[PDB]
Amino acid sequence: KPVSLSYRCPCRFFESHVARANVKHLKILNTPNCALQIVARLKNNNRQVCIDPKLKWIQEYLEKALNK
């Protein structure tokens, strides 16, 4: 299984337990029924990860940017 049945959605996986300090850049991607998917790249590890929008530091992130 390659994990793709006509993949309509970017993030089929999310990273839980992530650091505000290990991520260089957050870019959130919303998809109709695949919900809110966060895309973030790490600084040193440089990996592109999908961040789960229920993470606590992420809460702080959207609280800020959305209350802004």
Indicate the annotated binding residues for heparin. Answer: 20-30, 41, 48, 64
Give the Cα separation of 52 and 23 in Å (integer). Answer: 13
Residue range(s) defining the domain that contains residue 16: 1-68
| CB-CB contact of 13 with 50 (8 Å) | yes
Q: How many domains does the chain have?
A: 1
The answer to whether the CB of 51 falls within 8 A of the CB of 30 is no
Q: CA-to-CA distance for 18 and 60, rounded, in angstroms?
A: 13
Q: How far apart are CA 40 and CA 62, in angstroms?
A: 14
DSSP-derived secondary structure letter, 10: S
User: Determined by which method?
Assistant: NMR
Mark the binding-site residues, compressed into ranges: 20-30, 41, 48, 64
| Biggest distance spanned by C-alpha atoms of the chain | 43
Q: What is the CATH number of the domain that holds 44?
A: 2.40.50.40
**Helical ranges in the chain per DSSP H:** 56-67
